[PDB]
Structures are given as structure tokens and as C-alpha cells.
């Protein structure tokens, strides 16, 4: 997943490409007990097959000059022993699973703890796995404000205008 | 032997001047310049000083009087 998501690369304005074919895990140099004794990470080498494809100049169709397919070494990834452990520097380690807020949209109005009279100010928050946060909030004067990465507040319609929307079609939507 | 200091506090009072006078007197014994005034019972100089305070043999007034008279007789 990681390789497919980011490893294929294109040389900006050069159209020389480096693409990923496959990977494999090499045999660990040491066993677990030997790593515990000497003091080392029980890891397997990562050998990735890459292909550097060179595009002949002025070939928008896809005609390529040559392909250089070679297997290359990309670090050593620590391995998990048979009982869910990692030996990292000869010491047995455990990675504990994390309970975190799931990505998505959440509506989390405060309980009236902001302003007098205990008015409920509603808000929406978009949380991605990777990227910036996108919040919408309400002020006591009953206005809708957009906020990006928890920075200074802005009127919400700004985002709408930034998405190439005019006032008339904005009111048509809402 | 020593468990409580209530007779020494009584005889001197203020619970703080007792500490200072007892420290003066215990240091007097500890350095080879003075001897106990009560029968030593294997006690440390602090306890001996407290036991002398309880007996009334030591006060802040007695100690300074003795210091003064030792100074006066040093002239000889």
C-alpha cells in the first residue's frame, strides 16, 4: 500500500519515471536469541525492485527510451517474534495499539460553557488521516465561521467563494 | 536517659531558648573546656545539658555569669 500510494515518481517537467515493481524481505542475519545476546534489532532486509524508465524527448504518447530494472536495498524492517514482540536493541519491546479519533466529520457543540446564558454553539470538524483540519463553528451572534488547521476564524462563506461559488447560487444551496 | 523535655522547657520556657542554651552548654562539654554538672549516665552531651537544665543548675544567666568570671580570672 505504501509503495503504490507514493513510490511511483515523475521528474517534474522531465518526464523521467521511477516505478516500483515488487518487494521482498531478506532473511534475518541473526535469529532472535542471537540478537538478544549480541544486542541487535531482529530485522529483515527490504529489497525492492525498481524500474527507471526514461522517456524519449517529446513523447507524450508514452514512448520510452530505455528501462533500467534493478533490485535495491531499502533499510532493515524489524520483525515480530512468534509472540507479538520486537527485539530492537537486544531488548524485547511491545508496541501497544492506539485508540484514536477516527477520521470523518464530527459535530461537537460545546455544552454552553463559553458565553453567559449557556448558549449552545454548534460546530463541525473534518478530521483526515493525512492533511489539515477543517472546522466550522457558530458564534453567539448566530454567524457561521470556517476555520482551517485551528488558525484564526473566518466567515464560512469565504470557503464557498474559494470553491468558485457566487452569492446567488450560495443562497440557492442554503 | 531522656524521653521528653517538659521540666527543662518549664525551667527556661519559650521552647526555643531552651534549644539555644542547651546547645551552648552541650558544646561546652563536647569541647574539652567543661565537665558535666550532673552524674553522667552514659548520656550524650545534649541529653546531659538538658538534664542539667532540668535540675536548675544551668540557665542562660548562669552560663554567661560563668563565662564572665572565667574571662575575669583569665587575667591572672
Amino acid at each position: 500500500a505504501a509503495f503504490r500510494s507514493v513510490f511511483p515518481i515523475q521528474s517534474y517537467s522531465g518526464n523521467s519515471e521511477l516505478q516500483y515493481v515488487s518487494y521482498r524481505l531478506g532473511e534475518p542475519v541473526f535469529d532472535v536469541q542471537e540478537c538478544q545476546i549480541r544486542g541487535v534489532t531482529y530485522s529483515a532486509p527490504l529489497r525492492v525492485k525498481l524500474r527507471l524508465v526514461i522517456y524519449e524527448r517529446e513523447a507524450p504518447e508514452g514512448t520510452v527510451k530505455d528501462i533500467k530494472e534493478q533490485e535495491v536495498y531499502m533499510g532493515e524492517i524489524p520483525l515480530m517474534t512468534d509472540n507479538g514482540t520486537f527485539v530492537i536493541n537486544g531488548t524485547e519491546r511491545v508496541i501497544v495499539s492506539q485508540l484514536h479519533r477516527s477520521p470523518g466529520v464530527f459535530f461537537d457543540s460545546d455544552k454552553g460553557k463559553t458565553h453567559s446564558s449557556g448558549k449552545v454553539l454548534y460546530n463541525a470538524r473534518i478530521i483526515p488521516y493525512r492533511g489539515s483540519w477543517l472546522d466550522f463553528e457558530f458564534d453567539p451572534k448566530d454567524n457561521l465561521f470556517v476555520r482551517i488547521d485551528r488558525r484564526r476564524k473566518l466567515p464560512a462563506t469565504i470557503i464557498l467563494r474559494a470553491l468558485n461559488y457566487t452569492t446567488e447560487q450560495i443562497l440557492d444551496l442554503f | 536517659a531522656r524521653v521528653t523535655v517538659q521540666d527543662a522547657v518549664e525551667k527556661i520556657g519559650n521552647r526555643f531558648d531552651l534549644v539555644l542554651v542547651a546547645a551552648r552548654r552541650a558544646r561546652q562539654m563536647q569541647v574539652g573546656g567543661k565537665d558535666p554538672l550532673v552524674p553522667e549516665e552514659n548520656d550524650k552531651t545534649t541529653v546531659i545539658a538538658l538534664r542539667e537544665i532540668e535540675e536548675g543548675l544551668i540557665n542562660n544567666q548562669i552560663l554567661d555569669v560563668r563565662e564572665r568570671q572565667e574571662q575575669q580570672e583569665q587575667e591572672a
Binding site: 531478506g26 542475519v29 532486509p45 535495491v72 536495498y73 532493515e76 | -
Partner: protein
């Protein structure tokens, strides 16, 4: 709006000037040349200056308006190429030297290149100035990027070693051993160990320990140059013991022994000096001190002194 970022302010101020127009750099170099030529005319029209030049030539073998036109067209060139420095200074952003420091060292390099640029070569200014800017930035990193400065030659050795280790990491698979860098490189293989031993960046003394709450590295470091109270008391007792042992010696033997070693006096004296003070032969003082040390070796006379060992 407003910002406190110094780099943002620098970008704001510098970006105002248009980058350049081809054949504009040639004209700016021309203006610089005109200014220096004005200064040269001022110097050549000074008869005393020419007489001094002749005098110095013999030794060897045995204006304001001109400066203004030089300072100007140097401001114009340097400010016209401030974006060139930033493009080739953002390459080194995280080498222990902040971004604006690299920008400023590159700026000094660019100023030097402007000074040494020659337009009659018909060569683009960027090609020449890139060399100087890169030199300035890289030497700046070499000179002031580490707490314990290492010279430029040793940094070149370190970088060569790192490049070759990196290449062998992939050509071999796991890692190169220091003996294996004596083949890829041409070093005695002891220099490799020294270069590898060269201290890495010092650890911050405020480094949190795994707890990360209140345990910092500086909490685990002791004052190594301190006298233990037992050692100081032992020194005092040894001084007293030497005093009380030398007391039990004949007057001249005790004085000789106190002089030969710096015992409660100034620097130790020599046998010749002691004779100069005792008015006797040097060998006589030698015999005296040997006999004194023998007497001090007696049991029931140095049992405490040997207890001091």
C-alpha cells in the same frame, strides 16, 4: 497582516526588485566598470600616487563619484540576484545551521562573485555566482554548524566517508565494516576508525529521559573534579602525620627532608641549593636524606604512615 517571522520579512523586502532582464546584467557590470575606471583615473591623475607606484615597483623588482557608481550597480546586481541565493541555499536547510544563516552566508558569497564577475567573457552571471554562493554556504556549514568545530579538511574526509559508506550500503546489502572502507577508500584503516570516532553532535543536557516528566540528562551527570570529603580529611591527617613524624628527627635531617620535598614551604629545593644553604657537599646532603628515610622506615616509627597506604 503582520508577522514576526524574520524569513517572511526578508522575502517581503527582497522580492520587491524585479529579477532581471537579459542584457541588463551586462549593463550593470558596465556601470561597475565605469565606476572603477573613474577611481582609476583619479589615482592616475595624482602625481604623488604615480611616484609612489614607481617607488614600490622599484622595491618589488629589487573619486567619490566613481565610488558611488561602483557601490551602485553592486547594490543593483546583488539585490537582483538575492533569489538565486535562496534557491541554492534551501538545499542545505537542515544541516545544523538555520535557514537565514545559510541565506546570509550565500549573500556574502554572491557579493564576492559580483566583485569578481567578468562580463567580457560573455557568460551568464548565474553560472559563475552559483559556484561562489555554494562555496560560501558549504564552508559556512563546515565552519559553524557544530558545537565542537572540526576543520574543513576533516569535514571533507567525513563527507567522503559517508558517501562511500552510503554507496556500499546498497552495493553490499547490510553495512560496510571499517576494514571494508580501506578497500573502497585508500586509507590506512586506522584513520577510518579515528574519523568514525570523531564525536557526534553533543547531546543536549535537557534531554528528557524515557519518563519525560522531570528526568533530564543533566540530572545524571556528576562533578568529576571534586574532592571527596574522605580524601580531603585523609590529606589533612597525612599532613599532620608527616609533621609528627618529621618532628622525631635530628634538626638538620628534618630540615633537609622538609626542603628536599616541598613540605609546608615553596617549591622543592635541589641538593645543590641545600648545600648552598647548609654549606656542605651535595653528596653529603644525599647521604643525609638517605639516612633520614632509612630511619623513617623503622617499624614502630612509620606503622601509621604505612597505614596511610
Amino acid at each position: 497582516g503582520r508577522t514576526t517571522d524574520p524569513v517572511r520579512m526578508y522575502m517581503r523586502e527582497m522580492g520587491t526588485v524585479e529579477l532581471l532582464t537579459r542584457e541588463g546584467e551586462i549593463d550593470i557590470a558596465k556601470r561597475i566598470e565605469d565606476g572603477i575606471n573613474q577611481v582609476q583615473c583619479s589615482v592616475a591623475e595624482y602625481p604623488e600616487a604615480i611616484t609612489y607606484l614607481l617607488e614600490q615597483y622599484d622595491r618589488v623588482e629589487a573619486m567619490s563619484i566613481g565610488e558611488a557608481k561602483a557601490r551602485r550597480a553592486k547594490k543593483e546586481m546583488v539585490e537582483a540576484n538575492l533569489r538565486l541565493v535562496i534557491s541554492i541555499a534551501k538545499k542545505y536547510t537542515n544541516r545544523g545551521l538555520q535557514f537565514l544563516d545559510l541565506i546570509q552566508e550565500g549573500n556574502i558569497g554572491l557579493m564576492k562573485a559580483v566583485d569578481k564577475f567578468e562580463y567580457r567573457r560573455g557568460y551568464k552571471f548565474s553560472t559563475y555566482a552559483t559556484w561562489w554562493i555554494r562555496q560560501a554556504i558549504t564552508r559556512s556549514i563546515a565552519d559553524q554548524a557544530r558545537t565542537i568545530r572540526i576543520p574543513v579538511h576533516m569535514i571533507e574526509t567525513i563527507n567522503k566517508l559517508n558517501r562511500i559508506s552510503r554507496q556500499m550500503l546498497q552495493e553490499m546489502g547490510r553495512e560496510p565494516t571499517p576494514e571494508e572502507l580501506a578497500e573502497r577508500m585508500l586509507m590506512p584503516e586506522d584513520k577510518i576508525r579515528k574519523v568514525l570516532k570523531i564525536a557526534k553532535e553533543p547531546i543536549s543536557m535537557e534531554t528528557p529521559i524515557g519518563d519525560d516528566e522531570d528526568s533530564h540528562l543533566g540530572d545524571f551527570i556528576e562533578d568529576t573534579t571534586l574532592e571527596l570529603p574522605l580524601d580531603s580529611a585523609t590529606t589533612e591527617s597525612l599532613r599532620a602525620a608527616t609533621h609528627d613524624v618529621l618532628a622525631g628527627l635530628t634538626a638538620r635531617e628534618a630540615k633537609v627532608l622538609r626542603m628536599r620535598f616541598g613540605i609546608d614551604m615553596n617549591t622543592d629545593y635541589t641538593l645543590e641549593e641545600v648545600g648552598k644553604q647548609f654549606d656542605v657537599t651535595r653528596e653529603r646532603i644525599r647521604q643525609i636524606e638517605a639516612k633520614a628515610l632509612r630511619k623513617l622506615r623503622h617499624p614502630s616509627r612509620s606503622e601509621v604512615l604505612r597505614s596511610f597506604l
